[PDB]
Each structure stands twice: as structure tokens, then as C-alpha cells.
Design a protein around this nucleic acid. Structure first.
Ligand SMILES: [Mg+2]
Ligand SMILES: [Zn+2]
Ligand SMILES: [Zn+2]
Ligand SMILES: [Zn+2]
Lengths: 51, 171, 84, 107, 168, 97, 519, 229
RNA sequence: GUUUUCGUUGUUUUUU
């Protein structure tokens, strides 16, 4: 908490039980924590390797 | 000294008060607001010369509850005392702290230290006044005094007299 | 230096839609403030229709101070500024 | 040509006004932050764009004066704008009020 | 409440002593300066009136207003009763009494004659006419503002004014 | 919650000639306070009391040349931080010319 | 109108004059001397008089009145104080300008390296703009190797060589090149020296250095006293419902003032040289954080929790700061936002308004001779249904909470009173969608009070909005004066936005079911 | 000085057309009946046949149209296009007159050519945009009304009047009055926020989307890149 | 007793 700056936010989040899948799929996310520092489409665009 | 001033006023008229003679209504409203009021910038408001021919300009409409501004402009004679005013006056009351001189809307106050040494109080003689060799300061008498005090007091500016210089007193 | 003479007025001899809205709102608000009525009323309980009827025959005691860019202005009586 | 690129149409006069304003001062004026801020009108606009503090430092250092003639001055002071309905001053007059019947006389 | 035709006069730093009114030093304040403009900016001088001329003007204005009110039809009190307000009535009666008790010239003819005669600063001549004097030494004792001009030209003025004085 | 009136809505209203409408949206539907400012210094530096009817500009000793202003409270905030940053934004009810 | 009576005439601001604030005028506005960092006088209400939360500076609650003006939040306009700095400091946005003014005049005689003698400087001073004339003054000062004691014929100059001025840390340092190069005596430019040289500056000099004598001063550019805001500006802000966390401004003011008192203590005590330096720099970056905690290259003042401390500079620049988020954008009343639905049987210039919206939203109709009957019907009808008054406004300003009023229907209307008539059918209302690109996205529709909680619209009017009924939220605004209703009806109506000025074409047409049908 | 709701695409008839076709559409021929006005449509063909005042009037109008042809085809509209947003829908006005006053059949004309010519010359002056008395005021008036006058001439020349739709007294007078009224209603309203109007009218198009066009070229324009990509 | 009293920082996810 002392080093509040330069800290990643969102790696842990409240589990959703709105629906059953709101948990299941919720338990199988992935994230790329690069940030909008430079917008780009490569972090957002689907790639053939994602097949 | 009587001074003629281009006295003016701003009127905020209630929206229901529109009509043909509206401007003339303004007149009386000005007449009921200009008089009976003093200010440091002008002084005692006493009269408005040519009050039947006052120009207000083309009246403007307030964008709102419906009121109207009126820049009522005119010419008036309003009296105002000045410091160093060495003018004959009539005394109104006599007090040990200093005799009162009702000179216009104000009342002249004479300080304890601005009374001549030959002026001594003799309350027994009627009316209460000041007597000396060829000197008689009574009601309705012409006594030359100098207004030396001028301070703005929003409602009336006071005048303080001085009888402590050469050729001052009763003519 | 302020008022452009009525003949010197070089701008439109017609009322403008902005002037339309201003005059209508002002007159209807006035009569809503129990100001004198310059027209007749049949069923126009809301003052806006009364102001509209006033504008129809242009019996409105207002005057438009159309400001010129240089700083001067043109004064146009309602009844002399043509309906538009 | 850019407007015609997609095939859509835009009125001539408005973007003509655009290009003339681009050129009415003899050179090319940009919509860049400093380019618009290089203007020397009431700071109340250029500062409100961005970097407000720097523009205020420049203006106070010059002790500038704002005439409250921009519409932004009107909106952030909450009064009638000098546009359209506010491009004039509609006034209660006297020449037409005289035509009223005498019963309408204010008391 | 009441505005004025004189504007501007914002917060400035170049200050001057001309802020306290003073008659003997010829001070009239920033409001009553040498170069003033009316509502329309017309060039005009400050109005100064002697007490007797002021009395005639106020009397004639009051009688004209009374006759206009009558619309077809001379005392100070009846004229003072023109306006509204008990305090207004009191102050107008008091100022009319001040005018009556301190009008060195009584009727229209002598006040008019001295009006053409007295008319170089208008205010100094106005206060010379207003301040009743008898001879030169009294005038110089009572007026410290006219000490030296290399041409007093005042003995004739006082002689004629005393010739126009009200006898009793 | 109230409807946050976006700036593009302001711009479209301006193009619509909605002066009074937008004004009351910013005057009656939004912040609106009246204050008493000086005519000499042209600041809000006036001890004000309506019931006492006293308005003294401690900055300029001004009492008679004091004017009432019915303007948005956000304008008051703006004037406040302008003062707080040692900047003097002298409001003037007149025209210097 | 609705405000309590005030003899002050109704006027608006016509001009705004900028510039700096003199310390003398700072006291001329300072309603009370502030020297105590400590705010709550005895931790038992009534905060410290003469402190940062001085009640004399203003009142903060409902019942209390500002001791200065005599009124509370109802009329309390906020009042300012002054805190005398123990030592003159720099203004965060003027250090470049400190370098500028130090590149133009003498370090001892305090006057311009030239005068209008040379044609370049004279023509530079003929420029009306202050900043431009002063920067040209710089541009011609750099054409001279030394602070000329004579013509490059003494100009009253000191003659010492102009130091090389550099923004060295928070303050500046001047490399004096005294009698090929002498010992470089770059030193802390103490603000006292700068005050001296500024006072040496003649009014003609400051004028030609681009300044106004009656207004913003290089002397004023040096801070000698700081302003203490009214408590209204940084009030007790609720950290938890009732428990108030002290305002960030209050925190920083306390820090600055405690540092200032430390500086005040630096003299009477034993101060072995560098202690004064450290305490003065401490106070200095505290003051800087008062203007700007975001000093570049510095770890910003930060809360013990870890978050950085804010400044006034932050809340004035950005995307939704003071100007952006409170002045050019701010919330309004008599406004509603709800779902949109299709109403094929509805007219184009009407929106199907829920009874909730048409009821909660209302227009103040003044009681007139023609609407007296219907307005009285509305008042007697009730505040919890339609049509009906929920507040009746007296012509003087008094209001009645009809719902809480046990005699709701017993309000006899006076000609001049105002009745908050509930929004009827055919009421013109501003109509707003986000985003709103074209001016045709603002359209004035007539309220049609009809059930369901959506906005019922025509199909054709949806196409210019380029919106659908997949859950879009739409905005309605109710006029509150006759001027506004007239303006809506004559300059913002649905029929008035049919034609796009863009492609000088209509914005609307027959679509969907109707188009397939007409085919 | 017109608002963006009162102009409409109008085709100036003079600008296109073979000079021979243009002649046999615009020029008259009284002496030779082969290309003359047919006597059926007019009550004054005998007066028309052999007259010179009418011939010289129609001539002056013809060279006026030729001058307009130069003005448009060489200066204003140069290469391929002759349809432009101009005010006052002349076409609908003409059709309205025809259907109000029953301009069908081949009845002879009680209205003479000088009436048309005087009316046109009057109305050319009656167009008011910039008011005032200074010479630059009327110069700007001419500048504003040049295209409209040229188009009206391209539509309302006496020859076309008679050979096609033979406007009668009432028809012609109401046509002139309606043209003047619509033109005077076609003026810009002072006070419009034309800057913001332009801003929206340009931005909204950009809110929908190898040569540099569209948003790229827009941005090169708006940032004022010193050289485009 | 007419009247009558809640807020923010930060965090995540969202909505045509
Ligand atoms: Mg949506
Ligand atoms: Zn002041
Ligand atoms: Zn207060
Ligand atoms: Zn020196």
C-alpha cells in the first residue's frame, strides 16, 4: 500500500454469481496488462495463432 | 453653497406596471425615491428642477421575471455642505458642549474647543443664548460660522462649526 | 455613435426567427405577469398564444436593438419591422 | 474532395467560411493546442482549452483584460449570450405604448 | 440606489490629494472636477449659483410646478408642500427658510442685474456674489482663496453689490 | 442524479439560438448565487449584509459603489482559486474603453 | 427577484481584468490574520479563530452564520485571510519569468541594460503588448556582453557583469562573471535581492519590461504572503458519512504553515548554516505543492496511505476540472433520462412521456386571470398525481411543500403567484441523445403524458438520431419560463430540424415497415 | 447572404446547348416567319410581323443572354456542370402559374413582349441583399444577385415565355411577386452561429468512416501538417 | 414543526 504508485490493478476481482456462467467463464479469463500507452490494434486484434 | 447636479436614478419596475403613461409613473416613483435621501456623492436632495420633462431613454426589458430597467436621467438641485464653508447661519439650540445651528437638513455641532473665550453660558436670560459687546447669538440671528467638519454618513453628512478665527461670530 | 438612424438602418426590414422567439416569450411572460393585453382572447388561457396573436397583427410595444458589429445599433419598432 | 471521397455532400458556405478563416489573417492558422492558444483574446477560452494554469500565468504577468465578449464568458458567468435571440436588445418602447387606451395606465 | 453619468474611476495607483472637499483650498472632489461630462457626454461647465439667484430659481420652479398641477389657476410653505414625505417636507421647508434668511437680494430685478454683472473662474465669482461682504478688508479676511492676482478689482464690485443690497 | 448537460449539447443549443433556455439551465436549473462586489477594485472583497444593508469593500473602503451579481456559484469558485493563486481577476460591471 | 432584498442595484460583470495580487491588497482583502496551523480550537466545535478553519473566515453549517458578513451558506460569500511567509518565495509559474526578468536588468542597480536610446529597444517598447516588448528587451539585452555601466554616458547602471541565470533546483543561481573568466560565483538568488532590484526598477522600466504600474508587478511576482481560503472552499468533507476527513487543502496549508513556523524558529535558535537551507527548502516545496504538487523530477507529496497529495493546479487543468467539469459542463434540474420506445400512432413532434416523468418534472406557471381556474384545479387535485401542484410559489418567494402540506388543496392562488404545474401533454421539451454530433440531435418534442416508463416516439424521428430501442437512454428537459417555452417552440422544434444544413437536405424519411408497405 | 435551406439545385439553361440550338431556343426571327412566334399564341402577330422596336428589344435581351453565357461558361462554371444550389424555385412557380391560370390551349396573348421585358429588367434590380446607399453596397448587391439574375434570364426570357407558357397578366405579375417574396425570405438571418454550424456540419460526416482522403487527409489539414503524407 | 439531514478517494465491471 505504501508503494501505491506503479501497482497493477484488477488481477483479483469479485466473483460474479449473476448467472452460473458468470462464475465459470469468469474463472477462465486471461489478460494482457500492457495498457493503452500507445493504442495499437495488435493487442486487440485476433491473430491466426489464436486459432 | 447651492450646487446643481445632474442627478439620476435606476428604476427596477414590477412587470405588472406597464402602460401608456408608464414613463410618467416613473416620474412619481423617481419623485418618491429621489427625495428624503442623502448620499456622500451628492448630498441632501432638496429639489428637482423641470420634473415634468425628464428623459429616461428607450426603456429596456429585463430577460427574466418581467421587470424593466429605467435609466431615469434628469437635472436637480441638491444641497451639500463643504468644509471651510464660512457662511452666515442661524443657531437652533445652545448647549455647554456647543450650540446647535440648524443650517438646512443638518445641525451644526460646535466642538468644546471651538468656542471663543468671551462666550460664556448664561442660561438664566431668556432665550438661552450668548451675549457680549455688540454680540448676540439668538434664534433667527445672523451669525457667521465656518463648517469645518465633513464626513459621509449615508443618511446625512454632519457639519461642525468653528468660531475660533478672525472675523467670526455675529455680524 | 450608438443608434443607427431608422433610415440609415441597412439591415433586414423583416423580423427574424430569433427576434420572433424573443418577442413572443417576452410578451407572453409580460401578460403572464398581469401586464396590459394588446389583443383579444377567445380561449388562449396560456399566455403564449396571446403573444402569438399579438405578433400576428404585430401589436407589440417592443423594439429591437439590432447591434451592428462596429458598435452601433438599429432600433426597429415591432409594427414597422415586417413579419418574417 | 475529401467530402466527396465517401460520396457524401456538405454545404459550400460553411466549409468556405472554414477555409477563409484559415486564411483571413494572411497566413495558415492551425487547430493545434498552442496554435489556437497563440491567440491573444480573453484568456478565458484558450486556458479553458488546456494547460489553463500556464495561460493564466502569461495573462496575469501581462495583467490582461477580458471584455466578457466571448460567449464562453457569458456561459461561465450565466447571462444572455450575444447570439441570435441575444444578438439584439428588445426594449419596451414609448411611441407604440402611447397608442394604448388610457385605462392601461399604471397606478 | 442612484447612479451617475460619471463612470470609470477604477482601482488606480497614481493617487492625488484631491479627495477631501475643501472650499478655502478650492477643492470640489473627484466627483465635481474641472472637466465633467453629462449623460450624453455634452461639454458643459459645473453649475454654481448664488443664494439669491438660487432662491429666485427655486421659487419660480415651485410656482411653475404648482401652476402646471393646477393647469390654469407665493408663500414658501405652500410651495414646499409640493413633494411627498414628512422628512422631505421638513428638509424642503428648512432649505427654503435658509434661502429666505440668506438671500442678500430679494426681488427679481436686483438678482437679475447682479446676475449679468457678476459674469477667470466661474466658481470664484459665484462665491464672491454668494458671500455677502461690505468692504475690502472684510472680504480678504473672509476669503483666503483670492489673496493675490495683481488686479483685485473688488471695491467697485462690493460697492455695486451693496448698492443692490436690500434696505431695512 | 441530475442530467449532466454535455458540452456538445451546449454547442448545439447555441447553434439553435437557445439563449434563455440554456441560461435558465445554467441559472435556475444549476448553481446561482448573488454577491456584492466593489466598483473600484472590482472584486468580491465586500463584507455583505442584506438585513443590515451594509456592503463595505475592505479592499477599497467602497460602500456606495457596490453592485449585486446573480451569477453561477461555479463562477465564484473560479474567482476563488484565481485569487488563491495570487492572480487578480478584476471583475468589472463597466467598460474601460 | 427571488433573492432577499438588497439595496445593491442589479448589475452584471462587463469586464474582467487580470494581474497579480499585491501583499498590501492581500491584507486589504484578508478578513483575519492566519498563523495557527491547528484548526479545531478545542476539539469541541467552534474551530480556532485565526486558524485555517476560522469561523470569522466563514461558516460551514446550516444554522451558523459567517462572523464576517453575518450570514451562513444562505448568503455567506466566502471571506479570505492572509498568512505572512517567514521569507519571500517563488511562484511555481514564474521561475522561467524570474529568469526572463533576470536576463534584462542589473543585479545591483536594478534597471534595464539599455533604455529607449538605442532604436531597437525603443521600437520594442513601442509595442503595445507587455510580454512582447519585454521579450524583445531580452532579445536586445542578449546582444550586449555586460550590464552596461555606460552606452555599449552612464545610465545609472551598476556595471557588474550580468550573471548567467539558471533555474537551479527550486530557486535560481546566477554565475556572476566578475573581474579570461573569473571565479564563477553562481549563488542562491535569495528573494530579498530580487525584491531589491525590482524596487530599483523605475515605473518606466517595468513598463518597458512589459508591466503595468497600477497592476501586476514583478514585486507582486515574489510571494511574501499567502492567501488562506474561506472554509467553504475546503470544508469538512465526509470521509465516512459523519466522520469528516480533513480537506487536502487543509492538510497542505497545515504543512506549509508548520514549515513556515519552523523557518520563523530558524533565527532565534542555533542554526548551523545547512539547517536553515533544509528547512527553507522544506517550506519551499510545501508552498510549491500548494500551487503544484506535480513538480517535475520530484517525488510528489504523498499521503501516508501512499496516494499522492493534490494541488490547485490539478483541479483547473484537465478533462473535467473546474472549467471543463463544473463550468462548461454541469448538471441541470427538470431533466429526465429513460428508455425509448416506438409509437407508430404518435405524431412526429411528440414523445410519449411516462406519467412519472410528466409528474415529477414540472413547469412554474404564474397565476393569471385566465389560468386561475385550471391552476386552482391542479392545486386542489393533489401533489401525488396528475395534473397537480407539488409546490406553489408565492410572488414574494415563499414555497409550500404540497405533499408535506396537510392543506394541499387550501392554497388560494394570487395573481402573481407561481404554481409548479405538473408537465402536461403537448408540453415542449428539449430532447437530447448522447452522442449529439449535428444540431439536429437537439430537438424539441411535445410531451404526451401516456403510461409506460419509456419514451414513445415516431419511427421517422429516430433516424436522424440514428438510434434504436435496444435499450438506449434518452434525455428530456422541461422549460421553466415563458421565454424558454417560446424559444423551444420557435427555434428548436422537431419540425424546425427537418432539413440538414450540412447536405442542404432533409434529415428524415419514411423507413422500415412504412417504407416496405408504401412499396 | 442566403441560408442553407433556400438554395436548391437549378440548371441554368443557357450554359449547355449547341450555339445553333441555343440560338433557335433564345433568338427570335420576326421578319422571316419560319423561325418566328406562331400567330396563334398572340393577339399581336401582325404588330410583331415587321416591327423593329420589338426586334431590337429582343435583341438586347439576346446579347444580354450571350453576356451571361460568357459570365457563366467561362468564369463561374467552366467545364462540365451547370446545375447549382441557387435560391428561388423558378420551375415550380411557373408550373403553379400555369395550373392556377389554366395556361393550356392555344389562346392568343393579351400581354405584350414589352411587359415581360420591363418586368424582367425591373425585377433584376428589385433583388435586395445588402441594403444601404454606398456604391460598394450596390456592388455587393450585384455580386450576390449575379447568378440568380443569370439563371432567371436563362429561364424567363420573353421568347421562352411566349413559345412555351405564355404568361398572362395575372400569371406574370404573381410570378414576379412570388419570386421577389421568396428571394427576400431567402436571406440569411443575422445572429446564426455559423461557425459552430460549420463545425458540426463538417465533423458529423467524419463520424462515419490509397490516395490521401477521409480521416487521414482531414487530419493533415487540421493539424496543418507542413507537408502531407 | 411549517419544514426538515450525506459524502468522497481509489478499484473493477459495465451500458446504443
Ligand atoms: Mg443507445
Ligand atoms: Zn474594492
Ligand atoms: Zn460570508
Ligand atoms: Zn546596477
Amino acid at each position: 500500500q505504501k508503494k501505491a504508485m506503479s501497482s497493477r490493478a484488477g488481477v483479483s476481482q469479485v466473483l460474479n454469481r449473476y448467472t452460473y456462467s458468470s462464475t465459470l467463464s469468469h474463472l477462465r479469463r486471461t489478460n494482457t496488462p500492457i495498457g493503452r500507452d500507445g493504442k495499437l490494434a495488435k493487442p486487440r486484434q485476433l491473430h491466426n495463432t489464436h486459432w | 453653497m447651492f450646487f446643481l447636479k445632474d442627478l439620476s436614478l435606476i428604476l427596477t419596475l414590477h412587470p405588472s406596471y406597464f402602460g401608456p403613461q408608464m414613463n410618467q409613473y416613473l416620474r412619481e416613483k423617481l419623485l418618491t425615491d429621489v427625495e428624503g435621501t442623502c448620499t456622500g456623492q451628492f448630498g441632501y436632495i432638496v429639489t428637482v428642477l423641470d420634473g415634468m420633462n425628464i428623459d429616461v431613454g428607450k426603456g429596456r426589458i429585463i430577460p427574466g421575471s418581467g421587470s424593466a430597467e429605467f435609466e431615469v436621467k434628469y437635472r436637480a438641485v441638491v444641497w451639500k455642505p463643504f468644509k471651510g464653508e464660512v457662511v452666515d447661519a442661524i443657531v437652533s439650540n445652545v448647549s455647554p458642549i456647543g450650540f446647535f445651528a440648524d443650517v438646512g437638513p443638518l445641525n451644526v455641532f460646535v466642538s468644546t474647543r471651538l468656542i471663543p473665550d468671551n462666550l460664556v453660558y448664561n442660561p438664566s436670560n431668556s432665550p438661552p443664548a450668548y451675549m457680549s459687546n455688540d454680540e448676540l447669538i439668538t434664534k433667527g440671528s445672523k451669525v457667521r460660522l465656518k463648517v469645518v467638519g465633513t464626513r459621509t454618513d449615508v443618511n446625512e453628512i454632519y457639519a461642525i462649526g468653528s468660531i475660533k478665527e478672525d472675523f467670526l461670530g455675529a455680524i | 455613435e450608438l443608434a443607427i438612424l431608422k433610415e440609415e438602418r441597412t439591415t433586414t426590414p423583416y423580423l427574424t426567427k430569433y427576434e420572433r422567439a424573443r418577442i413572443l416569450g417576452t410578451r407572453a411572460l409580460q401578460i403572464s405577469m398581469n401586464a396590459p393585453v394588446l389583443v383579444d382572447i377567445e380561449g388562449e388561457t396560456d399566455p403564449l398564444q396571446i403573444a402569438m396573436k399579438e405578433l400576428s397583427q404585430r401589436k407589440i410595444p417592443l423594439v429591437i436593438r439590432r447591434y451592428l458589429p462596429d458598435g452601433s445599433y438599429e432600433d426597429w419598432g415591432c409594427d414597422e419591422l415586417i413579419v418574417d | 474532395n475529401v467530402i466527396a471521397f465517401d460520396g457524401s455532400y456538405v454545404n459550400y458556405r460553411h466549409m468556405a467560411l472554414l477555409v477563409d478563416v484559415m486564411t483571413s489573417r494572411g497566413y495558415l492558422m492551425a487547430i493545434t493546442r498552442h496554435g489556437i492558444n497563440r491567440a491573444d483574446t480573453g484568456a478565458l477560452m484558450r486556458c479553458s482549452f488546456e494547460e489553463t494554469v500556464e495561460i493564466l500565468f502569461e495573462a496575469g504577468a501581462a495583467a490582461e483584460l477580458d471584455d466578457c465578449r466571448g460567449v464562453s464568458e457569458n456561459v461561465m458567468l450565466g447571462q444572455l449570450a450575444p447570439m441570435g435571440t441575444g444578438a439584439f436588445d428588445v426594449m419596451i418602447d414609448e411611441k407604440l405604448l402611447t397608442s394604448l387606451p388610457a385605462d392601461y395606465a399604471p397606478t | 440606489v442612484s447612479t451617475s453619468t460619471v463612470g470609470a474611476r477604477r482601482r488606480r495607483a497614481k493617487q492625488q490629494v484631491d479627495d477631501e472637499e475643501n472650499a478655502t483650498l478650492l477643492r470640489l472632489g473627484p466627483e465635481f472636477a474641472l472637466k465633467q461630462y453629462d449623460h450624453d457626454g455634452n461639454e458643459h461647465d459645473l453649475i454654481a449659483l448664488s443664494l439669491s439667484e438660487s432662491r429666485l430659481l427655486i421659487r419660480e420652479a415651485l410656482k411653475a410646478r404648482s401652476r402646471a398641477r393646477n393647469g390654469g389657476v407665493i408663500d414658501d410653505d405652500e410651495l414646499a408642500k409640493v413633494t411627498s414625505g414628512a422628512v422631505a417636507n421638513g428638509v424642503v421647508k428648512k432649505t427654503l427658510d435658509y434661502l429666505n434668511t440668506f438671500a442678500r437680494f430679494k426681488d427679481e430685478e436686483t438678482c437679475t442685474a447682479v446676475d449679468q454683472l457678476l459674469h477667470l473662474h466661474p466658481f470664484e465669482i459665484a462665491q464672491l456674489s454668494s458671500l455677502g461682504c461690505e468692504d475690502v478688508d472684510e472680504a480678504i479676511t473672509l476669503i483666503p482663496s483670492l489673496a493675490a492676482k495683481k488686479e483685485v478689482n473688488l471695491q467697485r464690485i462690493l460697492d455695486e453689490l451693496n448698492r443692490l443690497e436690500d434696505p431695512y | 442524479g441530475g442530467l449532466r448537460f454535455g458540452e456538445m449539447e451546449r454547442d448545439c443549443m447555441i447553434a439553435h439560438g437557445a439563449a434563455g433556455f440554456l441560461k435558465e439551465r445554467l441559472m435556475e436549473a444549476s448553481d446561482a448565487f448573488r454577491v456584492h462586489v466593489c466598483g473600484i477594485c472590482g472584486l468580491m472583497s465586500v463584507i455583505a449584509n442584506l438585513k443590515k444593508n451594509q456592503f463595505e469593500c475592505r479592499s477599497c473602503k467602497n460602500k456606495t459603489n457596490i453592485y449585486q451579481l446573480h451569477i453561477p456559484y461555479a463562477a465564484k469558485l473560479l474567482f476563488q482559486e484565481l485569487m488563491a493563486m495570487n492572480i487578480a481577476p478584476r471583475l468589472y460591471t463597466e467598460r474601460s474603453g | 427577484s427571488q433573492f432577499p432584498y438588497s439595496s445593491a442595484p442589479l448589475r452584471s460583470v462587463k469586464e474582467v481584468q487580470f494581474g497579480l495580487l499585491s501583499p498590501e491588497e492581500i491584507r486589504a482583502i484578508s478578513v483575519v490574520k492566519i498563523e495557527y496551523p491547528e484548526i479545531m480550537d478545542e476539539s469541541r466545535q467552534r474551530p480556532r479563530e485565526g486558524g485555517l478553519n476560522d469561523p470569522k473566515l466563514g461558516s460551514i453549517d446550516r444554522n451558523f452564520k459567517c462572523q464576517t458578513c453575518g450570514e451562513g451558506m444562505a448568503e455567506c460569500p466566502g471571506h479570505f485571510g492572509h498568512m505572512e511567509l517567514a521569507k519571500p518565495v517563488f511562484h511555481i509559474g514564474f521561475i522561467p519569468k524570474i529568469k526572463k526578468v533576470c536576463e534584462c536588468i542589473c543585479m545591483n542597480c536594478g534597471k534595464l541594460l539599455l533604455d529607449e536610446t538605442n532604436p531597437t529597444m525603443a521600437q520594442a517598447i513601442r509595442i503595445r503588448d507587455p510580454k512582447k516588448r519585454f521579450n524583445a528587451v531580452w532579445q536586445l539585452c542578449k546582444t550586449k556582453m555586460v550590464c552596461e555601466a555606460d552606452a555599449p554616458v552612464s545610465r545609472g547602471g551598476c556595471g557588474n557583469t550580468q550573471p548567467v541565470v539558471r533555474k537551479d533546483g527550486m530557486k535560481l543561481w546566477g554565475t556572476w562573471k566578475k573581474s579570461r573568466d573569473a571565479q564563477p560565483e553562481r549563488k542562491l538568488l535569495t528573494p530579498g535581492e530580487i525584491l531589491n532590484v525590482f524596487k530599483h526598477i523605475s515605473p518606466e522600466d517595468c513598463f518597458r519590461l512589459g508591466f503595468n504600474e497600477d497592476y501586476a508587478r514583478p514585486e507582486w511576482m515574489i510571494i511574501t504572503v499567502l492567501p488562506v481560503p474561506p472554509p467553504q472552499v475546503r470544508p469538512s468533507i465526509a470521509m465516512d458519512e459523519t466522520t469528516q476527513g480533513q480537506d487536502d487543502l487543509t492538510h497542505k496549508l497545515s504543512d506549509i504553515l508548520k514549515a513556515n513556523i519552523n523557518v520563523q524558529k530558524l533565527e532565534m535558535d542555533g542554526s548551523p548554516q545547512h539547517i536553515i537551507n533544509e528547512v527553507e527548502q522544506l517550506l519551499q516545496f510545501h508552498v510549491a505543492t500548494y500551487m503544484d504538487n506535480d513538480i517535475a523530477g520530484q517525488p510528489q507529496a504523498l499521503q501516508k496511505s501512499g496516494r499522492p497529495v493534490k494541488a490547485i493546479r490539478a483541479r483547473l487543468k484537465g478533462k473535467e476540472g473546474r472549467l471543463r467539469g463544473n463550468l462548461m459542463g454541469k448538471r441541470v434540474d427538470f431533466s429526465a433520462r429513460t428508455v425509448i420506445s416506438g409509437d407508430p400512432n404518435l405524431e412526429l413532434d411528440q414523445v410519449g412521456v411516462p406519467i412519472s416523468i410528466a409528474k415529477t418534472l414540472s413547469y412554474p406557471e404564474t397565476v393569471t386571470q385566465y389560468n386561475i381556474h385550471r391552476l386552482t384545479e391542479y392545486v386542489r387535485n393533489g401533489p401525488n398525481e396528475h395534473p397537480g401542484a407539488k409546490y406553489v410559489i408565492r410572488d414574494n418567494g415563499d414555497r409550500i411543500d404540497l405533499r408535506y402540506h396537510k392543506r394541499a388543496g387550501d392554497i388560494v392562488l394570487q395573481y402573481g403567484w407561481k404554481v409548479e404545474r405538473h408537465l402536461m401533454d403537448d408540453d415542449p421539451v428539449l430532447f437530447n441523445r448522447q452522442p449529439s454530433l449535428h444540431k439536429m440531435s437537439m430537438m424539441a418534442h411535445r410531451v404526451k403524458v401516456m403510461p409506460y416508463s419509456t419514451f414513445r416516439l415516431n419511427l421517422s424521428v429516430t433516424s436522424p438520431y440514428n438510434a434504436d430501442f435496444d435499450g438506449d437512454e434518452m434525455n428530456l428537459h422541461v422549460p421553466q419560463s415563458e421565454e424558454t417555452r417560446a424559444e423551444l417552440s420557435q427555434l428548436c422544434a422537431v419540425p424546425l430540424q427537418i432539413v440538414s444544413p450540412q447536405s442542404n437536405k432533409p434529415v428524415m424519411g419514411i423507413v422500415q415497415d412504412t417504407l416496405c408497405g408504401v412499396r | 447572404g442566403l441560408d442553407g435551406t433556400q438554395v436548391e439545385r437549378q440548371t441554368i439553361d443557357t450554359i449547355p446547348g449547341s450555339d445553333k440550338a441555343f440560338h433557335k431556343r433564345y433568338y427570335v426571327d420576326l421578319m422571316d416567319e419560319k423561325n418566328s412566334i406562331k400567330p396563334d399564341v398572340i393577339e399581336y402577330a401582325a404588330d410583331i410581323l415587321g416591327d423593329v422596336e420589338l426586334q431590337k428589344e429582343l435583341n438586347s435581351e439576346y446579347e444580354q443572354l450571350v453576356s451571361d453565357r460568357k459570365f457563366l461558361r467561362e468564369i463561374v462554371f467552366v467545364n462540365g456542370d451547370h446545375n447549382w444550389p441557387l435560391p428561388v424555385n423558378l420551375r415550380r412557380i411557373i408550373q403553379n402559374a400555369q395550373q392556377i391560370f389554366h395556361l393550356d390551349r392555344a389562346k392568343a396573348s393579351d400581354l405584350t413582349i414589352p411587359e415581360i421585358i420591363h418586368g424582367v429588367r425591373d425585377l433584376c434590380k428589385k433583388l435586395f441583399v445588402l441594403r444601404g446607399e454606398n456604391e460598394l453596397i450596390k456592388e455587393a448587391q450585384q455580386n450576390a444577385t449575379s447568378l440568380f439574375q443569370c439563371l432567371v434570364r436563362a429561364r424567363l426570357a420573353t421568347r421562352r415565355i411566349l413559345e412555351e407558357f405564355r404568361l398572362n397578366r395575372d400569371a406574370f405579375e404573381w410570378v414576379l411577386g412570388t419570386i421577389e417574396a421568396q428571394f427576400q425570405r431567402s436571406l440569411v438571418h443575422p445572429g446564426e452561429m455559423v461557425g459552430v454550424i460549420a463545425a458540426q456540419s463538417i465533423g458529423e460526416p467524419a463520424t462515419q468512416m490509397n490516395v490521401t482522403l477521409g480521416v487521414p487527409r482531414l487530419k493533415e489539414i487540421l493539424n496543418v501538417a507542413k507537408n502531407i503524407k
